[PDB]
Amino acid sequence: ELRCQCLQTMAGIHLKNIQSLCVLPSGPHCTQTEVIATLKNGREACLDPEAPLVQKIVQKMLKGV
Amino acid sequence: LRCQCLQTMAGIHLKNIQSLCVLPSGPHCTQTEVIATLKNGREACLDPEAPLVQKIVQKMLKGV
To answer: Cystine bridges: which residues (chain B)?
Structure first.
């Protein structure tokens, strides 16, 4: 909890807007795994890896959409 | 605007990756591309279609 890149997780993300989704696994840097989705507009959104929706979007990116 | 991967590599394990990032398919690139920077710090392009990469990605999300 000393060099984490996310101060909060938020929900409501849609795959259509995402240009890049990246998973930061937990380590000495941060207590919890973090999902950062940089959208096509250039903004970034912190997502909670445990959430089902984010996992569904990841699996849709790899296979689908 | 263009693909970030000029090749594909195999043998990367969830234990070895320090950060994995998925770039979805679009006009920039025909195929979805996964770029995993390893604990050693070098980067490896992984093939999203492979079952192993998908399983490892979702395992990372779970916390493995």
So the answer is: 3-29, 5-45
